[model samples]
Target chain A: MMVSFTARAKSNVMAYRLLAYSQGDDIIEISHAAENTIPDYVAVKDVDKGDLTQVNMYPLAAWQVIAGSDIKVGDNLTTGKDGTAVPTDDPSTVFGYAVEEAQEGQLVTLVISRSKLEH
Target chain B: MMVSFTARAKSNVMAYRLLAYSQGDDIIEISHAAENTIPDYVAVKDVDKGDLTQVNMYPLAAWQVIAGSDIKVGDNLTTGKDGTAVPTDDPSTVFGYAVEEAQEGQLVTLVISRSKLE
Candidate 1:
């Protein structure tokens, strides 16, 4: 699966988001969390892809990683921003978290894009 | 499991680092290799999450990817720069390269951060 991070929290603490786009036409999952420090290392339980596919996230600060119990992902989805919930006005309806099952021995892929804001 | 990478070696080797943030967090594999082109294929074996966490880092630079066995990740811990292992001034107990096993169904997580240099 693919992973990306954003630190637009209320303070210095940062949030970590892990997104995995399935191979077939299915829902993608963007899992995330927050901590005082960045993750020491990322581990892949299973890997079928030989090359590393990395991309930068575009338009950062649009989402924040949160506790699963505190939030629930549904058909009408909205990502968090600055510790508050924000609704997406993207033209596409297909966005955010898609989870699927993998067969025996397959590698999940991650793609990212990034954009800078006017401070 | 989650994945990540670096691009700081000879001519943008962009050594792709697939760092899986395992569930129980074990063997903690950091599988990496270079690309004349980045792979378009990144399929997760599985996942299980409940948060949208994230973070940032202090400094940057320190690794590149080369084709498999072209550079086997031994028990060595040398990342790249604008593409080279500028080495570490800090003394550490453990460094790089660790691959192992996983169990039944579990979630693989990922974490990332960035820094700008002068």
Candidate 2:
């Protein structure tokens, strides 16, 4: 059973919704893919019907997010194709850095910060 | 004089801020470059010092935005290097489409919708 909890937004952090993609009945659950291509966002909390939930885009606050795969502390994170947080190094898709480690099907804490790329 | 107004966020639209890039003293004004290169977000409202203002990221609601250059209705919009909305066809930087036409230094209304490229 997955835990359902509300993630609080602090100053500088805001919530946004992502459109669900390619989800099958009953199998599709929370933290499902928000983007069909390279995911730019994820389901921050659980959803039963729409698969839509508030997600942190520019988090100045730290929050626990579901990890898409095994990630280590200090790993740069991005939205996985499945709407889960995946470690990335690309500055464009880079979302934030992991403060803790987590394996597949586990949670990882992230310091919400988007890429600062010039171009 | 530029008119200052408040942009209300509906159920879908949310606000985000971009870091100010290389700006000269007093020369840079509101609706200035939000990003140093291809701008991803722009100042939704007028901003002074610190150059920080709320911006719409995933707007389900339509909002007025400053255009970087001359734009036509139905033009695909992208963030100009100067932090104004510019037209583009690239799927990556594509932000939204222009709901109305506008010339340089004029305001254009945009339907707040990001690229839905699958």
Candidate 3:
């Protein structure tokens, strides 16, 4: 079973998109992994307003993420610029493993494990 | 059910101890998670390597962890300085929750999850 956390959504946040701790009031914004940013939250469902953003975040080992490109099983993944899944070409911020194959714009399961090296 | 991954144990890595990626040969070191470090692997059994270390790493929801302090049910936790369990006082690296009360030095069940804030 999964437990969801609540927060303020900055605009409309889609299901499964990665999120970050934004401004005060526990507000959260969609965030992408960057050379230095590795977000720890994921939307559990669509959220638009009213101090309500639903997420199971940080990660619970396996979860769904939208693919940023074609990916094969075992491919290392990180958040793309749009908060979608993309390969961890840098390995520095490696966060997940593709548990299933996926084409661009598809939702897929990933084994998310926050690596020590990047924390 | 759990699946173990293969790696080299830097020395004798105990069962359920937290591990960090070490050396270039997929070698692993027992890691006591630090203020700036959060490990992703956990030993599944006692492992001393001849090219073998067994771990069901990163974690998969509820799992077992050695306690570093007496803990109450629902206490938030993080890897201690010795890879044991301790309160997540920092909250910056929150990782698990005590599913049951725990006495120091005992193995306790925890609901591990990666958190989003510092």
Candidate 4:
């Protein structure tokens, strides 16, 4: 729905988790996202279809994201450790938003819409 | 040859286009455009494939988008009102680069990348 694309997995991908392109070619691959990691895409399926397996990815749209802390609806989010998303008031890491309320470690509906204001 | 995506014609999307989410759900449709709209995608042709149409939606590469005013090749770009593009001598609204020259209301190729200074 958001926007779909396909790429090979460089590591196991958690279904419904944020993804970052692996460092290094086609040599670059998709893997789990880390905090401060500017995730540009999301993986909707498992990649144990293992390393180098073709996986579907989506960029810029609504999907479920793991919450790192209790997050209310409309809270701006930043990439958090372990493919989770946490709230941020920092503006710069303002990338996605929580569409539904969520408690820590729960799957929350989120939309990826990056908007930063320069001072 | 850029990536493409489709959604119902939120508002008769322009031929060479820039689109934004209309406010409101299955309700918020797309419409013309705005200067600070932070465009994430563009349509390559008229919304002619029945209700759903193709929009070159990828943000990682270069693709042409309609310009609201004259733009020089290599100018930084942001979304302009009217489903068009504008120069970013301006916002955190900055999205990408103008790769070719364009007159008022014409298509200017742009590489859509979003970022901020460290």
Candidate 5:
């Protein structure tokens, strides 16, 4: 969900609403409710865990999305069961593509493009 | 189509090939073509226009995708009839989304994600 806009083009950054609990490094997604939702990736705004009670939503412009495992640049990325970014070809599950390569525990610079949420 | 890789992540940049005639500022597609195509936006490497002959293929990492009209940031973009980026919700036609808002005759900083091409 889109909260509001803060600024424009601060080097690939934007605002987003957090539907589920997320960490600052976790890859985020909209609640699997329906279509017509805004497409964007969530970069956790909180210092630690971002539970709905504490940090429900925050503004994210540019972030280091945590990778579940080895991922190459330009590879399609999706939310894994563990809530980390993983390489996926399902297309429907894709949240964004990896802009940088990373091994496990490394960060990949991710740009949000929600084609999966599109009709 | 993806030809080769020159470098990595020079502030949101990549490499691509010209499957069709495209200007330096045109939004590119994968020949209509099929699934399994690598998703990346082509920033025309040539000076002016690019064709199969003059510029058959080139490497593009970061590029200014021309918007058909006014477009806001985060709007899903697709290829229009004029080979430019236009807002679309179809999902499949999505080449990328707008990173910067643009008016007509302006350029939008586009980062290729290829959710439509996925």
Candidate 6:
């Protein structure tokens, strides 16, 4: 089952809702702002032990990284979330998606918190 | 609604299935292997007109890039899929997820073709 959570636009920041829950195989997706819209972030920490380097994070960040850029397959793709650990060279401890390339001069980040979710 | 497609493992290359369908808001996802077993790749081409540079691609390549590696948040996070275009600095055009980091010497690539999905 899926649920939705809405937030108020605080000081210039637009109001958005978050969808947090488990999908089929223990995959937990935390979407932001709009439900049934383009999910801001879909967390699939259930698959392959929730490897961090998977491509699932692509759609999460797609809001920012636009086209017309250059990203290599074997390049570093993790972000510094302060709480989230960045990518390493072990292939054993994955955090986020494996990046291909993000265009320059694009919206690179979108901050959506999970605390907004109401169980 | 979601559907499944299975393939055969051939020549040391294991065959897998592809789950292609729409979830909501015209969002389409193409998952592979073990239906609910953590999709190898989930393509959301319908969202935002399917921006290729979203973070959704993270889990797709995590099979290779593992822990202990270093990946900056604002770094280039696109791969060379031959037909897929690499990341540029325009931000107007997107392709895949925005990466943070991947460990070294890990399984960086998992080549799964969708043409076989039937």
For each candidate, how many residue pairs have backbone atoms clashing (under 3 Å)? 47, 0, 3, 5, 3, 102
lDDT of 5 at A9: 22
Clashing pairs in 3: A58-B114, B40-B58, B92-B118
Q: lDDT tens digits, residues A27-61, model 2?
A: 33333334323443444443454433343344224
* Clashes in predicted model 2: 0
What lDDT tens digits, residue by residue, belong to model 6 across residues A1-119? 12222112211211111222222221222222231122233332222222322223221222232222233333322222211212233332222332344443222233222111111
Lowest lDDT block of 10, candidate 4 chain B: B21-30
What would the per-residue lDDT of candidate 2 be over residues B80-118, giving only the tens digit for each residue? 644567787776766677889999767887774566223
Q: Give the per-residue lDDT of model 3 (tens digit) for A1-119.
A: 45655566656666766666666554544433333357666665776645464556343566677888887655667878567777765666777766557889888677665552322
Alpha-carbon deviation at A71 in model 3, angstroms:
12
TM-score of each: 0.21, 0.41, 0.51, 0.52, 0.40, 0.23
lDDT of 1 by residue, B1-118 (tens): 2233321111112223322232223222222222221222122221112222221211221222221322221223233222122122233412322111112121112111231210
Chain B TM, every candidate = 0.18, 0.54, 0.73, 0.71, 0.52, 0.26
Candidate 5, residues A80-112, lDDT tens digits: the string is 533456676677666655545788767666545
- Which window of ten consecutive residues has the lowest lDDT sum in model 5 chain A? A6-15
lDDT (10s digit) by residue, model 5, range B1-118: 2122222112222122212211121122123112222233444442222222122222333447556678898877766533456677776566677879998656776666566323
Candidate 3 error regions (>4 Å): A1-111, A114-119, B1-4, B26-36, B49-51, B57-59, B115-118
Report how far off residue B29 is in candidate 5 (Å). Answer: 12
Question: What is each candidate's DockQ, to 2 decimals?
Answer: 0.03, 0.03, 0.11, 0.06, 0.08, 0.03
lDDT of 4 at B55: 40
The lowest-lDDT stretch of 10 consecutive residues in candidate 1 chain A is A110-119
Q: CA shift at A87, candidate 1, in angstroms? A: 3.8
Comparing candidate 1 with candidate 3, which one achieves the higher DockQ? 3
**DockQ of candidate 4 (2 decimals):** 0.06
On residues B1-52, what C-alpha lDDT tens digit does candidate 3 reach at each position? 1333345555556666665554332233343344335656666677664445
Which candidate leads in TM-score? 4
Where's the lowest-lDDT run of ten residues in candidate 1 chain B?
B98-107
